[PDB]
């Protein structure tokens, strides 16, 4: 016990142990299997960070307060560290002979415990290649025997796949499942933890500041269990608060503060709002109204999605907006998406859903399962999604992808969760799902027969629920229809391409002017409400680009200047200069 | 009684060192009873105490408050889960079944296929039961498992193969909750092939990964939801009387899952629509939800009884359920209180009031 | 990078499991910013608390050296822990942190880099920075979730647009002493603007550096008679379009006559159908004078008409006159729903996975190329 255990009681009267609060059921059943004839091993067992090692301590720590029954007192713990035994046995029979040194100190001291923390450790010392006499084998006979008494802790995974593989040594150990605490629980752990860390960071925590923390903790960061995540959060904002009397903003630890913390950690935006983002929302619509014309209640839902989503009072456990864009070709499905993510300068995560055409490609959504080939590659989507916790999520043609793969979407839009075959949860809290598709417009491009034309207007909606499963589009935020684009639209998109021309035209050192007659002519040209805005583009391009590039590669506008576009009025044709 | 219950309890050791152990734990715990000096004999209630306190399962607890959280356990759920009282009956019922030792010898708690129409409190009543009994939630999306090779996720890769040192989901998540409420939310999406490993689960209660380890479901309550023949129920039949399609969609339930399935499923409980009053009763505690939100931020809200009435009559929708409701308190109130909010009169302080006009049906609004 | 390192001195000065843990993209800097943080230190420019404390760089091959007769490892991980404990202000740097999750004899993996630092880094008495890629992160790292929670993650995102010109002016004086040549500002915007647009399998903070290098190596090999030059937009330009494939500004050279006589040329091959040689060479000369689609291919082409007038000929000889490699792509091959398969590869955990797609690897393989696909009704 000189150089390879550590003497817990003599580390717990010099203050170096935490407190144990609650845990009196647990501490209770390690106590009674201390006190067993033979076997008498317990075996903490739990989740990473629900306080194994804390109790293992707080015993020791509570046998020198006295707080313990009449038969565990004088008992001195003693915790072994695996490095330091293995250290210096470099020779055969050295290590067995220092392990057996120790094990006959404690069978003679009739009243230690040890304590083997990460007991999982020990089913392997030898060297011979094979099933040698190591500590797992050194230590057999003598659990069974009850002459020495030995805790344990080992995560559930690790117990399950490695220490209870070797059934002679885990029948000798008495399982003790750790739970994670409850809110009201965790909040009582870091009352009485708060003097530790108030003394470490000198502040102070206020009880709204603790309760909103283990809150905040227990919703957003969800990949840890609760009394180890909750002081995290509180370590976090104390260590945060201590760096600022250097700058003289020194005070105690408020709410605001632990939800800054809280929203640096979930990677997550919670209260920037009172900062220069509440006009980024305010302008939002009328940002995206000029680079995306007609189509206004789309703009609306999706900044008011936005708006409820970073007021607060959004969806609990709900993406901020799952919304379906139905319409004809080339009305601005994509490209109001890809403005709004440019908008918020949020990660834009895309997915052609036409690559998804059959039932077996889920397996790149959320990857393939254990024993196959990708099994160490994970999904695509739910891996983009736990990288960019805080995107846009755009499915592109979803109407394309087989008719199965919607219901992976059905709990990512019910619940905000999708677990890839790694058993890791992809949070959806904070992502603007979009799915864009023209699925109900061939029903509407209809000739009616009769001498009485009728009204196809609910064919797109009929279509639509035809396609989509009714639990489906139950759970959307809102189905917004698009409508095909008008002439005065018209206009201002030619005027938006003929803009980004100009924008390309000053990257080579050249300018150009194009007259309202001009404008008005290339829009009368090439509209056609049946294929939206694309046969725009189409049209400048064969119009201006062509003339224009032959300018631009052959002699004239080399290093060019102020390119001018006239109309006629005897033939109609364009005009152009240097 | 010691050596029957750690026969029929502890199935992960064995008989001559199981019960000897039972038998070292009660004379240990006996003799760490004298708190009072009481030290007595060792009876069967003792036992049985030290038993469940291994083998991780309900005790006999009439004598505890878990007497009245399973008494008041039905009228506590019935005010979070409005309409669909058959159900909250079934489940608490077996509950108790389970909880007074009537219960079955090698099943799972229940195993109930809830079925019914959409945007009723089908997924939702299983999530309340889990908080009120305040028991771990196991929840498996089952739409993710629609390839037949899936199964190696739910049961852990076999030896040989990449995925052996990760376990299977379903498996691990039981062992480590023994007492649970397992959730297979959208059942019917899963491939045929994976109600199989199910059928095991409901007959013998038991389930074997490929580490060999038994997953023991026997404290566990199945519920699975699906939506099998949805789009039938939502359908208008063809003649002068609208047809009841609820038994349509019970003959698509027994066209989806084989006899041998169906047959040991303790109750197949077709929900039913949401009526008007039940409707009503939604709106309100959707404005609760609301009202605790805003609390978060310091605002209060109070809405008058009458613009409540507009809200259920503009959204009620019998064939959608209750999802329409909350995209009708969103787009009524949400929206405004989001606006007045962020950048409006409702910073840092609330007090907004909500009623409606009869001539224009609309709402009122204010700090 | 002011507020990640802020955020690491912030979880540097925990009471329990200080230990940043820098997980991004590959490329981004994570080590970048350990190393930046110790330069920092040397120069003051550090909060008070961060000040006199030396930050060491382990690496897990000098220390697993030798280490046979089982208890070296131990014995020289533990004296080095040892050495650690009794600073205070020293902080430990493991550049692959993913690596240290096995040190242990194989006969029972076990104690090794791992099981020996949890009850050191969950009792705070040293201090660890870690550095891993989000693939390692989340298959390696994080499955030993005793040690992930060890660790407080911090995301290392990619600089902006502006964030990494910045950089590159701050980085400038070293490649210019070691390269001995200059560049200009304009240069050094252009060069990160291009790397965002044609540099698109590595990230930002790392390909704009890779592109200055590059031209900076090159400018050294110039000088064949000692012409020595500042690097300007033009040769930045064409260092990128080794990777791009088609520089915008050499169309100048001896190539504007290409596209100039493109038409004619190939209408002494392809006789009639003029229209459709029109169509293909203007599309061509858009595409090279910078008219071109942002996000598009060059062109998009349906040829129609009775067979064998010409359709496939004028392609071929297209891909022949530009030098361009013909992707050819017969779609009568994929008459069939499940075809597409072999177009972008089988989805993970079937046969054909570590196969890849045809279509994608050929376009990711030749950037510059034609793609043809015969008989497109047939598909
Ligand atoms: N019962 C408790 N009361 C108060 N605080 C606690 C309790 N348990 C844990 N903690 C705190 O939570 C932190 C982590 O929990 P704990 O140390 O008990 O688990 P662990 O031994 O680290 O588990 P693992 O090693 O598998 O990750 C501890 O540093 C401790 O401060
Ligand atoms: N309402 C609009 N106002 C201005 N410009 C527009 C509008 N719609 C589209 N455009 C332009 O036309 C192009 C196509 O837009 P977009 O892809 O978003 O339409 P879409 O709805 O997605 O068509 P599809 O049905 O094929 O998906 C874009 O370059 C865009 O700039
Ligand atoms: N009977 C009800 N009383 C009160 N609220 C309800 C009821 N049903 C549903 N809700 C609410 O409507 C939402 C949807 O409920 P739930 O998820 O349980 O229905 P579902 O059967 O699972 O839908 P689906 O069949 O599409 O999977 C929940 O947020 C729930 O709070
Ligand atoms: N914030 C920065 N300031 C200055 N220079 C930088 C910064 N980031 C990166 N660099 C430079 O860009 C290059 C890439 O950064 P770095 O090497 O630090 O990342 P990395 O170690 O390769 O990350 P990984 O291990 O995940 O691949 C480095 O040469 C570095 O000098
Ligand atoms: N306008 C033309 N100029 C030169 N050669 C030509 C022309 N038309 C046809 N040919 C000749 O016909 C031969 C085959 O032509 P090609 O392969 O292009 O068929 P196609 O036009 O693509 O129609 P399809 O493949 O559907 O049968 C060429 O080798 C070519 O010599």
């Not at 072994?80 to 020779?91: E, H, N």
């Not at 003097?195 to 500041?209: G, L, N, S």
């Not at 990677?267 to 109204?289: A, H, W, Y």
């Not at 009714?470 to 698009?482: G, S």
């Amino acid at each position: 016990m000189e150089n390879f255990t550590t003497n817990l009681n003599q580390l717990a009267r010099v203050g170096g142990i935490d407190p144990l609060i609650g845990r009196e059921k647990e501490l209770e059943r390690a106590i009674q299997v201390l006190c067993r004839r033979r076997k008498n091993n317990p075996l903490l067992v739990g989740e990473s960070g629900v306080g194994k090692t804390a109790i293992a301590e707080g015993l020791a720590w509570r046998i020198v307060q006295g707080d313990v029954p009449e038969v565990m007192a004088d008992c001195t713990i003693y915790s072994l560290d695996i490095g330091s035994l293995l250290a210096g046995t470099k020779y055969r029979g050295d290590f067995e002979k220092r392990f057996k040194a120790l094990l006959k100190q404690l069978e003679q001291d009739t009243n230690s415990i040890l304590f083997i923390d990460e007991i999982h450790t020990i089913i392997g010392a030898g060297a011979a290649s094979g099933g040698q006499v190591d500590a797992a084998n050194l230590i057999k006979p003598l659990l069974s025997s009850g002459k020495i008494r030995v805790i344990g802790s080992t995560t559930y995974q690790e117990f399950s796949n490695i220490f209870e593989k070797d059934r002679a040594l885990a029948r000798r150990f008495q399982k003790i499942d750790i739970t994670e605490p409850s809110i009201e629980e965790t909040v009582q752990i870091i009352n009485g933890l708060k003097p530790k860390y108030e003394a470490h960071h000198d502040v102070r925590y206020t009880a709204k500041a603790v309760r909103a923390a283990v809150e905040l903790a227990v919703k957003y960061i969800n990949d840890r269990h609760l009394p180890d995540k909750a002081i995290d959060v509180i370590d976090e904002a104390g260590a945060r608060a201590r760096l600022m009397p250097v700058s003289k903003r020194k005070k105690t630890v408020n709410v605001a503060d632990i939800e800054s913390v809280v929203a640096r950690i979930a990677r997550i935006p919670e209260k920037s709002v009172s900062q220069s983002d509440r006009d980024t929302l305010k302008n939002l619509g009328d940002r995206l109204k000029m680079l995306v014309f007609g189509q206004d209640k789309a703009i609306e839902a999706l900044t008011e999605a936005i708006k409820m989503a970073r007021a607060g009072l959004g969806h609990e456990h709900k993406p901020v907006g799952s919304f379906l864009f139905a319409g004809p070709t080339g009305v601005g499905k994509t490209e109001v998406t890809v403005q709004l993510s440019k908008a918020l300068g949020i990660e834009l995560l895309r997915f052609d859903m036409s690559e998804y055409m059959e039932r077996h490609t889920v397996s790149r959504l959320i990857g393939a399962p254990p024993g196959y080939v990708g099994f160490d590659q994970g999904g695509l989507l739910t891996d983009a999604v736990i990288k960019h916790p805080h995107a846009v999520l755009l499915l592109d043609e979803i109407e394309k992808a087989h008719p199965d793969v919607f219901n992976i979407l059905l709990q990512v839009m019910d619940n905000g969760t999708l677990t890839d075959n790694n058993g890791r949860k992809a949070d959806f809290r904070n992502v603007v799902l979009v799915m864009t598709t023209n699925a109900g417009v061939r029903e509407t491009e209809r000739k009616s027969i009769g001498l009485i034309h009728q009204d196809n207007s609910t064919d797109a909606m009929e279509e639509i629920k035809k396609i989509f499963t009714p639990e489906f589009r139950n759970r959307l935020d809102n189905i917004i229809w698009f409508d095909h684009l008008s002439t005065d639209v018209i206009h201002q998109v030619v005027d938006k391409f003929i803009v980004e021309l100009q924008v390309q035209l000053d990257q080579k050192g050249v300018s150009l002017e194009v007259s309202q007659e001009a404008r008005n002519w290339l829009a009368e040209k090439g509209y056609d409400r049946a294929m939206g805005a694309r046969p725009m583009a189409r049209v400048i391009q064969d119009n201006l680009k062509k003339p224009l590039a032959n300018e631009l590669l052959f002699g004239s506008l080399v290093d060019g200047g102020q390119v001018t576009v006239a109309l006629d009025k005897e033939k109609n044709e364009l005009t152009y200069g240097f």
